[PDB]
Design a protein around this ligand. Structure first.
Ligand SMILES: [Mg+2]
Ligand SMILES: [Zn+2]
Lengths: 262, 37, 103, 158, 46
RNA sequence: ACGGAAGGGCACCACCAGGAGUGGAGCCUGCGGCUUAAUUUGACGGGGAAACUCACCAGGUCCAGACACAAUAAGGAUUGACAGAUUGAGAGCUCUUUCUUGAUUUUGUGGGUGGUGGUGCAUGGCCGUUCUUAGUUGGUGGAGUGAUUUGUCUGCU
């Protein structure tokens, strides 16, 4: 249990931060990042009942003043929550602009974002709305090639869904320098959708694949055609043969054939 | 606003339900309000 | 030795009277002292609603309704009889309430 | 906590309405039939009468968790005060295979003979079975052969 | 480089469990900044 | 189809017999009009109402561009903790510090990222209205080459 001084002072500051719209944030709210236990103190302020302004500004403050794990805990326990809450409880099911700019302020630390925002989002009922919106977030923000490659390699190992393919498509449209292992995870992902005739198939083998999977396959085959071996290229041209698109299939095949192995 | 259809207008702010009259008339049967007389 | 008061509230009289007669006969068939199911007035909650949806035609009016019935039964029994009866009698539509105090 | 009686009951009607709506919209390809919310002292039990539970209870039970949190996150329940149960298909008390392996693992782990059989029969009869019968044949740590029947409810044999 | 970070992305729940197992500490006022309650007193006096 | 040929209903949003009135008065309130920097706007808008609601005015602020691309840059490109300078109406805004810096580049180009860019096409569908169906329909049969007709009628009800 906490001191009653902390209780009353941060319930008072928690009544302040409900209506705060401009000027300077409270003095007791800017000394919380410097605390060894900022998370027992940040709860008394009542995180879900801040105004969108305080969401944006506390995102700035705590993602710019805490460490990577602390920025991750913050973006996971408060920002992701408020994000999903404002998308779910609103009536056109839209997101406020301050919560948004806050997500854009949580993607300045891509490790904290991906591990704390994107990954616990996609694995807890990520519908098409939250991923149209978070997909817009990631599509707008510049992220380091290493954290982008690692987030890509995480989204590739994820169960197939149209939002996750939106995300993989978006990180492949970045066209950065991926390590050969990330490109490996890409080829394995786009491989797992072919039909093995020898008696070993899942659901990804015969399922209906959207426009986004063929676009992501097209961008992958466009940027990383020189960074795949001959074997992986044959597996991918095989996936083109079986699971190819009417217009995109031939161009993915052409983008795999016009490449030099490593 | 009406917690169903993005409408500032029509709001039945009574009893804390906050559905506009159009949507509340539809959701009336699922809430418990039925046609007697 | 617990002296408990039970109060039911429901809109469908068939389920409410099912639960009421159930608790009555189940309470007497194992020998308890009780005050029979007393019947509070059915309150009829009505909502006045304009006939005019679109501003075409003069203004005439209408009415919606709900009937809410409430009962109560007083009993004296131990802890186990009350727990078991409360768990067994749970029904949808009918809302049961068990109060222990007598003040 | 604490809302006026009429407003309490009407808001419970709105609650059932909204969860019924969300569950009709979400589990459309899981043969969703209906829902029933039971308010208990500790937690709230949202029972999903859905005629395809093998999908509602997906891998590691995930699709239930993912749902509870939803029905939590928007309705703002305290983590643990909301619980979703399913009813129809993937009810392991309606599969005789899972109960013969439950009985095999009840006797192998070193339980009793009547506790294992009455526990399995009661669990089968709790999951919504019209009836149950469990037959235990063998030696029963003895020298002569014995056969036991544990029948409960209603079954047809012809 | 990569092998270091993907074991942190793919197993972020397990690495969060291990970081929260190794590095959790209960609320201690004398182990924060020592001029912190000076700021609790400086704000609560307006 | 249409009739302003005639005939019936069958009606206090029709008339009789009235009753209360309104229109005349002050005040209220809505609409128009004028006036206004704006006097937000629809034809009761749950449209009750000094902030809010504001959708309208006079000014002061932020935050922009996904990216691609060319220079710069680590011997500095520039992002974060502060204190005074501030500072006008209120905030920001910039530069001297103690400081984090540390490539998030600063700047300039292009097809479009952004579509938390709105307009349109197709498709599924939900809420609002109508003939608000309150006399129709079609089926066999008869008559007519046919449009059509008979049923669906003299009677009486
Ligand atoms: Mg004919
Ligand atoms: Zn509405």
């Amino acid at each position: 249990a906490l001191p009653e001084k902390v209780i009353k002072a941060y319930t008072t500051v928690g009544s302040i931060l409900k209506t705060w719209t401009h000027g300077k944030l409270p003095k007791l709210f800017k000394v919380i990042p410097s605390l060894r236990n900022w998370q027992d103190v940040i709860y008394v302020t009542n995180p879900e009942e801040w105004s969108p302004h305080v969401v944006y500004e506390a995102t700035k403050l705590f993602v710019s003043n805490l460490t990577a794990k602390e920025s991750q805990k913050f973006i996971n326990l408060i920002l992701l929550e408020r994000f999903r809450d404002n998308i779910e409880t609103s009536e056109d099911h839209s997101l406020n602009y301050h919560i948004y700019r806050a997500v854009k302020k949580s993607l300045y630390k891509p490790s904290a974002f991906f591990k704390g925002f994107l990954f616990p989002l996609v694995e807890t009922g990520c519908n098409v709305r939250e991923a149209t919106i978070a997909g817009s977030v990631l599509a707008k923000v510049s992220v380091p090639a290493l954290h982008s490659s690692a987030a890509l390699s995480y989204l590739l190992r994820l169960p197939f869904s149209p939002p996750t393919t939106v995300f993989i498509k978006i990180l492949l449209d970045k066209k950065y320098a991926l390590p050969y292992q990330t490109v490996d995870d890409c080829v394995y992902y786009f491989m797992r959708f072919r039909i093995l005739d020898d008696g070993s198939n899942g659901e990804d083998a015969t399922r209906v694949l959207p426009v986004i999977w063929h676009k992501a396959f097209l961008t992958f085959a466009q940027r990383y055609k020189n960074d795949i071996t001959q074997d992986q290229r044959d597996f991918l041209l095989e996936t083109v043969r079986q699971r190819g698109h009417k217009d995109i299939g031939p161009e993915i095949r052409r983008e795999l054939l016009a490449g030099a192995s490593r | 606003q009406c917690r169903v259809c993005s409408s500032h207008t029509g709001l039945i702010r009574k009893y804390g339900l906050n559905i506009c009259r159009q949507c509340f008339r539809e959701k009336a049967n699922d809430i418990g309000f039925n046609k007697f007389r | 030795i617990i002296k408990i008061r039970i109060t039911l509230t429901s809109t469908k009289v068939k389920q409410l009277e099912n639960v009421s007669s159930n608790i009555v006969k189940n309470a007497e068939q194992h020998n308890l002292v009780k005050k029979g199911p007393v019947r509070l007035p059915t309150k009829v909650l009505k909502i006045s609603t304009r006939k005019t949806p679109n501003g075409e035609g003069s203004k005439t009016w209408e009415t919606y309704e709900m009937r809410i019935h409430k009962r109560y039964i007083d009993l004296e029994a131990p802890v186990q009889i009350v727990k078991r009866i409360t768990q067994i009698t749970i029904e949808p539509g009918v809302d049961v309430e068990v109060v222990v105090a007598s003040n | 906590a604490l809302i006026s009686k009429k407003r309490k009951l009407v808001a419970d009607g709105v609650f059932y309405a909204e969860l019924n709506e969300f569950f009709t919209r979400e589990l459309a390809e899981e043969g969703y039939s209906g829902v029933e919310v039971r308010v208990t002292p500790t937690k709230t039990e949202v029972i999903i009468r859905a005629t395809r539970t093998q999908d509602v209870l997906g891998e590691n039970g995930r699709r239930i968790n993912e749902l509870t949190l939803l029905v939590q996150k928007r309705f703002k329940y305290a983590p643990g005060t909301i619980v979703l149960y399913a009813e129809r298909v993937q009810d392991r008390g309606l599969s005789a295979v899972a109960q013969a392996e439950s009985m095999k693992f009840k006797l192998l782990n070193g339980l009793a003979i009547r506790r294992a059989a009455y526990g399995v029969v009661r669990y089968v009869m709790e999951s919504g079975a019209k009836g149950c019968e469990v037959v235990v044949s063998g030696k029963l740590r003895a020298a002569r052969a014995k056969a036991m029947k544990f029948a409960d409810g209603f079954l047809i044999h012809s | 480089q990569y092998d270091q970070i993907i074991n942190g992305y793919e197993n972020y729940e397990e690495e969060l469990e291990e970081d929260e197992e190794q590095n959790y500490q209960p609320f201690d006022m004398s182990a924060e900044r020592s001029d912190f309650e000076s700021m609790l007193d400086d704000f609560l006096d307006n």
